[PDB]
């Protein structure tokens, strides 16, 4: 299991100790407050009212928590995933990332606190 923080201004994402292998079932729970620029902060679902201006993940809101598994595309995480199997046979190290537009991370603030564990299988 892994626990740690994902900073909103960290464009490269936060590598975890979790390697997702074939057959794994995982659960993720994320909490906390972050911003992509505004004074206001949002939780791990991000800002539902904000337009997509070239986000790294088009299937989550600006300011949401997302991830990559190995060489996968970005996958939404939001507040978390319950007893979840990765689609399309993706595998590898899990990296958590704040959803913003590339090159605009420098004004971001806050972080999310994230737990990931493997479940029974």
């Amino acid at each position: 299991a892994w626990k740690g923080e994902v900073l909103a201004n960290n464009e490269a994402g936060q590598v975890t100790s979790i390697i997702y292998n074939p057959g794994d079932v995982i659960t993720i729970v994320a909490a906390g407050w972050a911003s992509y620029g505004p004074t206001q902060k949002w939780g791990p679902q991000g800002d539902r009212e904000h337009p997509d201006q070239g986000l790294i993940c088009h299937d989550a809101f600006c300011g949401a928590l997302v991830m990559k598994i190995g060489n996968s595309g970005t996958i939404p995480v939001n507040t978390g995933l319950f007893r979840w199997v990765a689609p399309n046979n993706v595998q590898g190290a899990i990296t958590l990332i704040y959803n913003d537009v590339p090159g605009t991370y420098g004004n971001n603030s806050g972080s999310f606190s994230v737990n990931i564990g493997k479940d029974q299988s």
Copy 2:
């Protein structure tokens, strides 16, 4: 396990099929959008900017997801709980509840989706 929705307008909350017993380890993941009156909506951590005017749970923000276990007082859930064990004594059915001031749920809207499961212990 149990999956369902918790309406922001329901002062009675949503009973689940999960009975929390001593020593149980549980995980909850919550998502969605709700409001305690204003046009804006917030996720399950609620509105960090809003003062407590008599909330049912003084340890979570207005608009956050909380729960009771049996006849306990309210306990924060927020975006969820990861492999969590209760304080000694609580037992009984989990009921999920939107955090607002009693008598003021009339103008509330939206809902949270929630998954609850028992973990290894």
Copy 3:
């Protein structure tokens, strides 16, 4: 989870810290060597050659590991149980017991080492 020894000469059995509640899924692994009287010893499946002369559990061999849940009748455990649900209407503390004839435990020897855990549900 619980880990402990169950002595073969212990007619009252070994009460564990595990309380089986409705809906629980459990796993048990048992190991070791014990005798109901003879000089040789057998594992937790007992002695497949030995006739039943009034055992506390008629559905396991003499020298097998069995259990009660609360005030239930005896239930076979043998080498263990994998992700097992109890019959309806059985609940309470798990007590582990060596399978022998009542009043004949005095000449028994050895013990079984047992682990019990609750699984995801």
Copy 4:
């Protein structure tokens, strides 16, 4: 999870679907009756009275259940493993094998019924 049987007369062993990866926690439960040649039978701990005349696993009795993980040496299983983590650098498919002297499996009989699962980690 894998469920199946391991024949006493199968010298090559039984290659399961469980790929043990770094960090995994596994549980195995084994049951049943088998023999290395005699008309008598033993459970998955094998025959405690029998000398070791060149067994594939010297840390278990003749007639016990043992395993390999990838290209590891043999590891005793006996009646099972409870929430077990492998030695460092040990990884790969789990092969289950009856413990007998090489070249002497042809007179063996019976089988053990075996369940393997991955636990939470």
